Amino acid sequence: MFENITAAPADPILGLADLFRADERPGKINLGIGVYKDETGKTPVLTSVKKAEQYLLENETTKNYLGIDGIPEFGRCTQELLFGKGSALINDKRARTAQTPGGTGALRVAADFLAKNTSVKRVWVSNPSWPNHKSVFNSAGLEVREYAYYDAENHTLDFDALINSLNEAQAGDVVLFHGCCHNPTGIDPTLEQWQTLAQLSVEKGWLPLFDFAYQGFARGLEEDAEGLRAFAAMHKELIVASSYSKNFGLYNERVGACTLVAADSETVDRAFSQMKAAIDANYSNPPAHGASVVATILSNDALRAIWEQELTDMRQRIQRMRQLFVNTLQEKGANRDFSFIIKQNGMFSFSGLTKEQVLRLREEFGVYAVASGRVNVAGMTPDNMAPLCEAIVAVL
Amino acid sequence: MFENITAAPADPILGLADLFRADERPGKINLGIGVYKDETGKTPVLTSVKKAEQYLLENETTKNYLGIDGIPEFGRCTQELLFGKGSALINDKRARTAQTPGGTGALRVAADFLAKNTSVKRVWVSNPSWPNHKSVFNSAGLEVREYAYYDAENHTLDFDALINSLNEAQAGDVVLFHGCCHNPTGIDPTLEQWQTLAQLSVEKGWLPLFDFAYQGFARGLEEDAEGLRAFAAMHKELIVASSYSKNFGLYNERVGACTLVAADSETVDRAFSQMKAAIDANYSNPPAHGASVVATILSNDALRAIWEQELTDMRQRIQRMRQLFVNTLQEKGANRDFSFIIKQNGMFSFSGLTKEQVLRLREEFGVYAVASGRVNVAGMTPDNMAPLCEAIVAVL
Secondary structure, three states, rough: OOOOOOOOOOOOOOOEEEEEOOOOOOOOOOOOOOOOOOOOOOOOOHHHHHHHHHHHHHOOOOOOOOOOOOOOHHHHHHHHOOOOOOEEEEHHHEOOOOEEOOOOOOOOOHHHHHHHHOOOEEEEOOOOOOOOOOOOOOOHHHHOOOOOOOOOOOOEEEEHHHHHOOOOOOOOOOEEEEEOOOOOOOOOHHHHEEEEEEEHHHHHOOOOOOOOOOOOOOOOOHHHHHHOOOHHHHOEEEEEEOOOOOOOOOOOOEEEEEEEEEEOHHHHOOOEEEEHHHHHHOOOEEEEEEHHHHHHHOOOOOOOHHHHHHHHHHHHHHHHHHHHHHHHHHHHHHHOHHHHHOEEEEEEEOOOOOOOOOOOOOOOOOOOOOOOOEHHHHHHOHHHHHHHHHHHOOOO | OOOOOOOOOOOOOOOOOOOOOOOOOOOOOOOOOOOOOOOOOOOOOHHHHHHHHHHHHHOOOOOOOOOOOOHHHHHHHHHHHHOOOOOOOHHOOOOOOOOEOOOOOOOOOHHHHOOHHHHHHHEEEEOOOOHHHHHOOOHHEEEEEEEEEOOOOOOOOOOOOHHHHOOOOOOOOOOOEOOOOOOOOOOOOOOHHHHHHHHHOOOOOOOOOEEEEOOOOOOOOOHHOOOHHHHOOOOEEEEEEEEOOOOOOOOOOOEEEEEEEEEOOOHHOOOOOHHHHHHHOOOOOOOOHHEEEEEHHHHHHOOOOHHHHHHHHHHHHHHHHHHHHHHHHHHHHHOOOHHHHHOOOOOOOEEEEEEEEOOOOOOOOOOOOOOOOEEHHOOOOHHHHHHHHHHHOOOO
């Protein structure tokens, strides 16, 4: 029935870093770990986090249902975080926002709501893509269509190619644009480059969707939130599926947003009254906690000032691990240009470790990087650099 | 596109109690409010709640991603809450559990996972049904099929009728059984009565699903969790989609479970490895908070002992409002037998207020009960009884 003749074959969190406990090793680190990690390789409760949580405990008098759209401040600031300021999408009210359990959990929200109401059948992808994006897309119809993103060799973005096999298929066809920077590649489009495909998405029907997981990680937070803004006062209709789990260190309590910015007020009202609709049908109403905690910081003149900064270093640290990794090669290695990393936004970079390198790695080297030469510059440590940079130059 | 030729017509939280602020009234209460409310008609942060939350704040060192299945204790106790003890479904390991954002959010989980893997096309319903169950069901295929539940007149359960037009359609057809007691009706099957349809679901293919939102509200918690247990060491395959939001007063932080109890270990493993699968595709991984907080109480010998009891009175209070409502009529009213309530589990009862009674109610009476003669015995107060019981006997 249900019973047998069931497949199994699960999501590869596990392509790496699980049984890292493994065969009782002296192993350095786990690299290609998604989440962020310090010089002790710890995943902490910020401070901001906790200083806001103190608030709640004593201030919260009701764990009563939170609205279907979650909370409205969470939005108003989500909103001015995204693209806004005093800025008119906010004042046009061309923008209407949703409290979603994750950005992951605001990307399917995007699916099943756009399946119906909207004339969507396909989702144009990116390659390499964050592969939980092929999956959550056929979660309610649709199909993903993986265009040309990274062109290998000189480890960068192909615009020659992307602007070719993306360009392709039909007017009511959507894409989901990728923030500042990428997964698995750390690669991005420049505002020159992006601004340039904004007018080309204005001119081909298209109609965007964006995955905004990392603001102020390796570009800035605001200029890194402008590679969206390129589009924002350009389009008419679009959507942002955003997170707080990377920049707030709030992975577990589930928070993101589903901002549909339709062309009016009254439109943005109903294209969304149906966006309103979706929520109910699974998890009617969002969780409060991490959500509460994102609005609260922003609110306290002296709490976000401490968050923004607690964010700054989560970066300084990433940006650090790049320049370091590479010194450790020019300084150590002297082989190939290990170069290209530093100048790629995020914690992710697509190492050029063609596959069974990444394998004659997990042994008598007890080292982990997820198959695609995909590493976490986040779990790349000062104390962890040296050991690593030996086992790279050994594997070549 | 998305833009216009969008419908709107939203979920009627709103069939009542929103604009209750309304036309500047002296109005009593809002009755038919779902959530629970005290003698001050407040929706509180229990104590248990907060005493567990103190724990977390200081004890929690990571807001790092929670597993896709959420936490395992949450399950192990969910598990022994459900049906277990030292009891073998637990030790057969015929049962395998999921941390879900709600029971609402563990009922679609049930849908899209059973759509595929499993040979399901229809969901047999109940009438009156909790109407967020027609909706979240066509959320990924399927169709609901509303059998005979309540037969009106002498305001009870029809077994004559239910055992007739439920019985009907085909072997790979499922139902979702309704806990102890009901929504909107407060009506239940007895263990004699239920035990009697257990062997008749064993004999017709069928294969259950249960909605377990209210344990220990107007039957007991355990005997009220046995009207499941009737089935549990009966079936082979089934599922429970449970909540903590009513019994934990944790509406907002989102918690429930998705317990698939397949016939073995290795089966329960894969019919579920696909149950494992679903989670990812929307909200990969559950929120921690309220989830954390449910396991923690159970754990502390002296914290659940305080929760179980904080639960006891949330009931004493409901059970109170029944006997009272009715005194207030025999004592006040003297008309019809207002009787039937007290002896119906939960906070809900299906008042016999045929529709435009419930309407020549919301005026110069400023009173609210959601259309179907559907009231909250939870928002029925001592100070609120008298006023109410005047406007009933006035409307007849």
